[PDB]
Amino acid sequence: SNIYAPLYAPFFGFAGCAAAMVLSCLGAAIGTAKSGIGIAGIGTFKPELIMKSLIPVVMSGILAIYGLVVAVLIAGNLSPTEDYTLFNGFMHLSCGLCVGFACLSSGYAIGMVGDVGVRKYMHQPRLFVGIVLILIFSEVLGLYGMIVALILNTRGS
Template sequence: MATMVSSSLGAAYGMANNGTSIVAMSDMWPELIMKSIIPVVMAGIITIYGLVAAVPTASSLNDDISLYSSFLQLSAGLSGLAAGFAIIVVGDTSKWGTTQQP
């Protein structure tokens, strides 16, 4: 459960941040909207990866799960959260570069 929630939070934050910067950039350069939508699509893919990772972790849950397995499942979700933050950095940097030199 934490796998899906964490990766979805990271993807949602990545989409929100990159979406607002796309809207801000489209005011000055409307022809660059399609180039700038790539980070939003990448953030959506993280949600799909989180769902793919959540299915095996949910099927392996039982009463006698080890602490090691629990931390592995938690780290799978946190990697999706970290990937969402990385997409924010990459998306903002690419948009700044695109606006400087289209």
């Protein structure tokens, strides 16, 4: 075996996909779930507004879609039949931990603000365009995790 390519490289490579996936799904979960607390709260008062109320959860589930396509891309680059470097092995853990915390943070923020955003949305109609604007600045924190990770994946191959 080459010196630059030891035999324990599949450990860190498969550490990356694991960390990229489940931490993404953690952010996507509580991003969705904490908002649904607020959604079902005012559903008792106002039956109507729910068709505008599913915008926090569909923006929450897209983080798992980010977390998936970063995980499906880096996997499949790994097989027994070819030897890949430890240098390429570490960066999948780097790519993995990068997206995993980023859209977790995006999940946290739009979880809690998506909770309180539709919470007192029953009082006024017009604050909708405001709260959907700050969700866009809140969502791109998970988009910032990917756009470096795709750059981080294409290094060392």
